[PDB]
Amino acid sequence: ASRGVNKVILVGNLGQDPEVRYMPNGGAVANITLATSESWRDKATGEMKEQTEWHRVVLFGKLAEVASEYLRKGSQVYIEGQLRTRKWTDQSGQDRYTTEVVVNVGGTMQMLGGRQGGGAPAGGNIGGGQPQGGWGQPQQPQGG
Amino acid sequence: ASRGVNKVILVGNLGQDPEVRYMPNGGAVANITLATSESWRDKATGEMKEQTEWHRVVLFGKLAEVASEYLRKGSQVYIEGQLRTRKWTDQSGQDRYTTEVVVNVGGTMQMLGGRQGGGAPAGGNIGGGQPQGGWGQPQQ
Amino acid sequence: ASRGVNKVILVGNLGQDPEVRYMPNGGAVANITLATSESWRDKATGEMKEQTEWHRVVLFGKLAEVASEYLRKGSQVYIEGQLRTRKWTDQSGQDRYTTEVVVNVGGTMQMLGGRQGGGAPAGGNIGGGQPQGGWGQPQQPQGG
Amino acid sequence: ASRGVNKVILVGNLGQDPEVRYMPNGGAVANITLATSESWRDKATGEMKEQTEWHRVVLFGKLAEVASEYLRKGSQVYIEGQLRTRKWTDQSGQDRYTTEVVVNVGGTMQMLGGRQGGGAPAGGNIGGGQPQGGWGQPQQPQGGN
């Protein structure tokens, strides 16, 4: 199996506001930044040192939409995506940018306090109802 | 709630030999490279496409020493680490590198590897095998 | 190779207050009940539906200590542990108990902030989960 | 929030063949057993110890079919599912089973392998030269013929 597993689990706070960008052709796309912290008391004559990691997280589809309307700086989110390193030339110099992508297998949930609203957090993809209560149709799958 | 969780879980193959490097203090470090990939079929863009991500993964201490002597090009491995973005200066201007760090509460496990085996059966391999006929070859 | 990977990740809230106990033989122990749920629209009838899962989590040492002095009913927590199925005779009938154990490698983290004592959400308890009861249960502790 | 996260990640060997079974209403279903282990370098009277866990995994849909056709006892797999405790009763007194359910967001991947797999140690290679079509899209120091 050359495929393998590429998973990133994050729980952190948006160190800044969500940058949403709609694309009437491919869909919307939000870019947020999450910080994770580590505290250890030590080193010289100092009281507990801190070190925070900032993570570039890119949301697609409905997740980027949900984000945009309900997420703001300071929000606490749980994120499940995969790593993506992309190349680009800043002018003549080749550069690489690593980010955490939230595709269809991944997800995001608003933490902090209080849940969402009507059937959320979610994201149209897999599911449905397919009520089976007509004059027949007892054969084929109930769908869903 | 201000510390969050930073966890990377990876299963993939090394694309090189465990480049181990000791740093003036004792403990050693192994900079390994792992690959994971996704294969998309479709046709709108062609026939069958495939993206393969290359992860920069760093090991420290025992796990580094383990990796060097056991892990090789092709070795499949499981990893639990955290994401670290570090700054270095080649031609100045500053370059940022995101690596998968496997430190203390992180871990790496060898698949189909590890060697040495797992101790032994507290009821077999005493000197030959099991009763009835002979030392039952079928052990798997 | 042989060991394998046994990992569980959970995010949810306590359905009750923590159940601790100290015993000079390994420190402390704590029992927690977490609920995870799934919003269920269900329009075939018009009204919403639910389905919450209850997970038995056991914390040890520091985390057990921390849990008692900080964790309270309704508290939202993040748990990383492993599965352990233990056997026991309840007085003739042999039973099995699968729970979520947080050992050294595992972890626990509170998803709120600097709140006095513990933290009990003045939200409530939505219906739609726990398709069973729980009065006069077996178990085989008795001690401390 | 109410929802929460119910995720289980497993890497182990099948303890037996994938006991698969179809059914009218529900599509394909398949029950499998998975083992994982952990041993401490301690010692009591000589050696160390061993404590393997057996997990009850449930697969649905195409996954259960794949398990049946290609999964074998001893096969090493990676699993991602959610924990589900189901109540039941075959005699009385009610029984509660906790299992690993693999579905939608879940996934299952066959592990195993071999080793490096040298390019051309001793097998032969034929299929176009090397200069034409090397490295990335742009040129940059590379033979082009």
Question: 3-state SS of C52-65?
Answer: CEEEEEEEEHHHHH
The alpha-carbon gap from B107 to the nearest alpha carbon of chain C, in Å, equals 9
Helix (H) or strand (E) holding B70: helix B62-70
Which residue has 């520091």 as its token pair?
C62
DSSP lists the bridge partners of residue D84 as D99
Interface test with D, best of C3, C5, C6, C125 (most D CBs within 10 A): C6
How far apart (Å, rounded) are the C-alpha atoms in residues B65 and B28? 7
Q: Tokens at residue D104, please?
A: 């939608």
Of D8, D19, D26, the residue nearest D71 (C-alpha): D19
Contact between C59 and C109 under an 8 Å Cβ cutoff? The reply is no
Q: Return left, alpha or beta for C34; rule: phi > 0 is left, psi -120 to 50 is alpha, else beta.
A: beta
Which residue has 């309840």 as its token pair?
C90
DSSP lists the bridge partners of residue D121 as none
Q: Return left, alpha or beta for A143; rule: phi > 0 is left, psi -120 to 50 is alpha, else beta.
A: left
Q: Return left, alpha or beta for B12; rule: phi > 0 is left, psi -120 to 50 is alpha, else beta.
A: beta
Sign of CA dihedral D29, A4, B72, B66: negative
Contact between C10 and C79 under an 8 Å Cβ cutoff? The reply is yes
Q: What's A119's DSSP letter?
A: T
DSSP lists the bridge partners of residue A80 as A9, A107
How far apart (Å, rounded) are the C-alpha atoms in residues B8 and C14? 26
Of C101, C84, C133, the residue nearest C31 (C-alpha): C101
The one-letter amino acid code at D23 reads M
The total domain count for chain D is 1
Q: What's B62's DSSP letter?
A: H
* B78 interface with C at CB cutoff 8 Å: yes
How far apart (Å, rounded) are the C-alpha atoms in residues B85 and D46? 45
Contact between B57 and B32 under an 8 Å Cβ cutoff? The reply is yes
Chains linked to B by 3 or more Cβ pairs within 8 Å: A, C, D
Contact between D1 and A110 under an 8 Å Cβ cutoff? The reply is yes
Give the determination technique. Answer: X-ray
Contact between chains at B37 and A11 (C-beta distance less than 8 A): no
Contact between chains at B5 and C113 (C-beta distance less than 8 A): no
Q: Tokens at residue A110, please?
A: 């608003």
The alpha-carbon gap from B62 to the nearest alpha carbon of chain D, in Å, equals 15
User: Alpha carbon B91 to chain centroid distance?
Assistant: 31
Main-chain dihedrals φ then ψ at residue B83, nearest 5 degrees: -85, 130
Report whether the peptide linkage leading into residue A121 is cis, meaning its omega lies within 30 degrees of zero: yes
Helix (H) or strand (E) holding D35: strand D29-36
Distances in whole angstroms, Cα of residue A4 to Cα of each of B87, C1, C107: 28, 16, 25
Instruction: Please report the residues numbered 16 through 75 in chain B whose beta carbons come closer than 8 angstroms to any beta carbon of chain A.
Output: 34-39, 52-55
* Resolution of the structure in the document, Å: 2.2
Residues 6+ apart with CB under 8 A from D19: D30, D31, D32
Chains linked to D by 3 or more Cβ pairs within 8 Å: A, B, C
Chain gaps in chain C, named by the residue before each (C–N > 2.5 Å): none
Print the domain residue range for B129: 1-140
Of C101, B104, B79, the residue nearest D78 (C-alpha): B79
- Could you tell me the CATH number of the domain that includes residue D92? 2.40.50.140
